[PDB]
Structure 1
């Protein structure tokens, strides 16, 4: 999946590992670590979520109590829009014949959270479904790709 991303997007933010480079991890600093939290963990860009035996009220309050630090300017109120990433039909092949099995990931550019079709696309994925050697249905499963597999 990582490699998939790294070529699917290549030269874009999305083509980066969430764990970061080996170098970065080696040299990141008290500084930059600060900066991230600093620049990134900001109120508008956050959602306090809860579910269980709790009343919205009670909760909402506690939040009003600790989620202080009020924003002065207007920049601190502005949700930064991200520069979009270029999809690129391509491939990356990491060969190691010493690897027991092989993995293969194929994909196409998606529509994005918003777009409704994401629903359809899912309904689709539901038809091709999924499979591992332990499913019991085996040869009787409904996913054509499964059965054949």
Structure 2
């Protein structure tokens, strides 16, 4: 028993949402994600490549409107958000593949 590495019970993923609203907060945060494959899977290499295409942004990227990332460009051209990031968080048997952005209350919809 002592030298056997325990296998954890699998965690079920659920398409769903949680909305914590506080209009008193200056900017909104939003994160969206689908279930990832988990450490072992090779596809993670492709997912990471994919995340690189979309990439990330933040109001201090000097590249501005000429950034290669389309989402970054639009973000700049339309002042869509303060920042955004893609991610591929892995775990043993699962993971989260998504993105998170910070935007002003009135640009959330266009950003999304």
Q: State the TM-score bracket (shorter-chain normalisation).
A: 0.5 to 0.7
Q: Structure 1 residue 139: deviation in Å?
A: 0.2
Q: Structure 1 residue 131: deviation in Å?
A: 0.2
Moved segments of 4+, more than 6 Å? none
Unaligned 5+ segments in structure 2 are: 76-112
**Equivalent residue, structure 2, for 1:89:** 15
Q: Does 1:102 align with 2:28?
A: yes
Among 46, 55, 62, which residue is 1:136 paired with?
A: 62
Q: How many residues of Structure 1 are paired with residues of Structure 2 in the alignment?
A: 75
2-side partners of 1:90 and 1:106: how far apart?
10
Q: Does 1:111 align with 2:111?
A: no
1-side partners of 2:24 and 2:74: how far apart?
27
Unaligned 5+ segments in structure 1 are: 1-74
Q: Structure 1 residue 129: deviation in Å?
A: 0.2
**Equivalent residue, structure 2, for 1:125:** 51
- Scaled by the length of structure 2, the TM-score of the pair is 0.67
SS at match of 2:51: helix
What do you get for the CA RMSD once the two structures are aligned? 0.2
- Scaled by the length of structure 1, the TM-score of the pair is 0.50
Q: Which has the higher contact order (CA 8 A, sep 6+)?
A: 2
1-side partners of 2:63 and 2:73: how far apart?
9
Q: Does 1:80 align with 2:12?
A: no
**Equivalent residue, structure 1, for 2:82:** none
2-side partners of 1:133 and 1:91: how far apart?
28
Q: Structure 1 residue 101: deviation in Å?
A: 0.1
Larger Rg over CA atoms: 1
Q: Say which structure is richer in helix.
A: 1
Q: Say which structure is richer in strand.
A: 2
